[PDB]
């Protein structure tokens, strides 16, 4: 009951977790780095004082993000990711049986050698012939290169006012930036921030209102993340049908992706894609486009 | 951004609300009692330094306690809420235009007056000539009438061995007491404690698990609840298939309840029922069983 | 232990007490206020988010600041209070059977009704006939009119660096506004913040050394208030002797003082004006003089 | 600005340090240990969740614990230490050159090896040829030994019936095994809980009363410790006057201690031992004594 780690969540709500110890401490140009061993959620990442990733429950998070898109692709070979610096994006990434070419893609070279160091459950995704790291921003390394992808993935912070990932989520960056480089049949997804039943407005319906001007396919999708304080959101947005059933998840699962999932089979998914009622009528007549 | 309320939902684990206002903090012997202004939730009941409700989305809680049961049997008419001190499962009941009485059995007489007087949002429920209040324990009165019932709502506290409310959760309170009292195709649901992706393992699946001992169809069912930082759990119980379309559900409100829910449709109430995989595997695989 | 208000002593420091209520609130154009029922030291002043006062200690700070200016002085006839507004620093001076009037002047009017409204233990002093009470800047108030005190009786807020109470504990403002004011053998004394063993350098030393320039006779002095969590400090200041026994003030307080002091006796004032080693080899070796 | 130790310092108040690391956590059966680097205190010893010891301040504690005892001794050579398993108060007595021997006794050897590796303080006064280290209860050593002391120093903690410290400060305990073990002229001091305005009523008036009643000239003392969030007690006993100026004990400090003290000298301990006259007066008429 001693030492505690203390999270402003919203303006009046504090998310406080007692500490087993402060592990290690970095930091780049661009934020602050803390790995804490925190008792009820393990090892977590914590950037610019927001805890980012825990131990205990990342894997639903980034099987959550990831599993989804590949699977409702029926050959996804190529896969770009927009963040995920930790290395648990590209870790269930490389999973999966028809990835020939994983790309990382984020900003901050001291975040990913810290989480390259210290996140042991990722070093054997790291290593991987499979995965190319690339310091530079999104935008900017897609519209430099012309290598069309299978699957786009979106694992940034959030697109608050002001910051630099902003710009990441606009209807013009979809549209023009990172829709050409899809190939045909591709596959977006992103993560899309806070879906409680009333933090789902923040973000969450502003990014499927987005996608749904530029994708004639998109489904949200949630699940609860308990280190996260709430349940936490995630659009897919293809041009091709995006609906299968639990039994061809579950099958297309125990087929393409090495080993059991812990969280994630297709009832999980149909459930999850199934939003409650106020956040189903939130997101089906929100009007706000992120220009 | 100076006075908070704190909450230890897990001894490690702390959840704080930046307040307005204490309304009242007062006690009975069951319970100290206290009623918070917060900021991010409203306005608050506190039982035992947990929080047991906040006015921003206690109707989640409550109308996921009460309607999929309602909803799921042929004509509800009588219905028997153990606990419900607060008046907001015995709200949700009177909105449905089936219900001609509803009995309220708390054994703190206490709570029941505070909330008569504070939380006003069930003030009319309150005074509906369908409600009867009993100050019991539930097990006791259930014991005590020969009445059956078409549904029986568990709203109590969590099963922690030594409590007045363990016994309301064995199997043999269930099949010895409570079964005989329900009318054919009758339906029990009970609150069932946390139900996150680790949490559920504490009560949800020993809930669930001998709610199976006893009854033919055991539907267990979740959903997050902000003020409560977690998932919380329900479970529903019955002799008679409890398996309605979302669109089924959905006409049956339509029909008899007033007003539109605020949370809960026929597709949420499908959604909800689905567990994800560990938690399914965990209430398949559950082995124990409550009892004394 | 559920509702807690919580302050921020330092920056690295808070000091958190259990809540009873939150009994009222105002506001002025100046600050905000409010009064809290804590659990462990009962009804709480708390002006703009600080601890101003707490029912349980009040009596230390209120009779540590005012018992032994006057004491010292052989007749102390007038007594103006720069600040005050809760009404306790005159509630102590009314005790006293030598008093003929004491102005109180608080340029926060909303404040002194507020205190004269809420706390019941002053309410005999507010309703007293030696008691004026002025809403103005002290200063302001000080150089307009021409009478000359006894006694002046510093309690403002601590001299912050960007506020307005800094210009009253400046030497020039002692030197040519408050000892003007003073009549022949004159006493002043002021509160002088924190006086701990480290913190007693923020701003009690600088006080201290400050008065030095002006009169000829100063004395620090101080006392632990828990409800402040440091030991609080006082300075007096007079061009006459302030060296009195602890058996003549145990006289003169059995004699001019009604009713029995809870706090101070003369042995009690002897110790706290033996100020620690290390806090007295501060203060004798301090050289910044507020201007 | 978002790690923070807490303390609760009173069930109702708590005291917080933002943290830079935690160097160790650990236990033994009687506690346990951590060692914490914190911003405004530095690195902090918090046994069994209390803090015990703070780097920018427990000079303070320990200078006031025994300095002056040993000053106010007209020669005192041997020093046996009650607890005393952090290092510090051995380091402060064998700051003084009359001292031949000290004997430091802990119960718990976990802490001693804990801070004779990580304290470092505190190196050479553990590595120092006058110091013995001794694993045992107190009071079973003292009784175990013929041998006479100049000066014990009390130094465990506070007295909670049931606890291995509470019999360390009973009458009985002072009178039929301490007493007999100091020598003409000896003094014991010892620690004695909170003292501020009103904490001092916990056991620092029992304390003082206690030894009232044991020994001819009983001197009780206060100084405030930061890290502690309260002033702190100790209490002089001896059969001996204890009755030297501020002068005569800073002239014995420049005589017999090596290098400054940091927080005592003669003046800060007449101020220390003048106390308040609610706290002198409830000394005063203290009826209390610890007994078992």
Redesign the interface.
Known sequence: ???????EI?????????????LHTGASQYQDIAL?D???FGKAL?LD?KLQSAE??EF?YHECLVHPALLHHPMPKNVFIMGGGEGSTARELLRHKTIDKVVMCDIDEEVVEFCKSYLVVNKEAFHDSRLEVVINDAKAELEGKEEKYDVIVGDLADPIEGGPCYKLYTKDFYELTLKPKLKKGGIFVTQAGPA????HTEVFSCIYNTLRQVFKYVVPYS??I?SY???WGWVLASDSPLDLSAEELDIRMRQRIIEE?????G??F??SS?????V?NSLNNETHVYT
Not at 274 to 278: E, P, Q, R, Y
């Open positions: 009951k001693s030492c505690w780690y203390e999270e919203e303006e009046n709500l504090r998310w406080c977790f007692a500490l087993n110890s402060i804490l925190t008792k009820p914590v004082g205990t429950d639903i409680g039943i009333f933090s699940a609860h308990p304080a709430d349940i999932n812990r969280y994630l089979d009832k999980t149909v459930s199934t939003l409650s009622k106020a189903r």
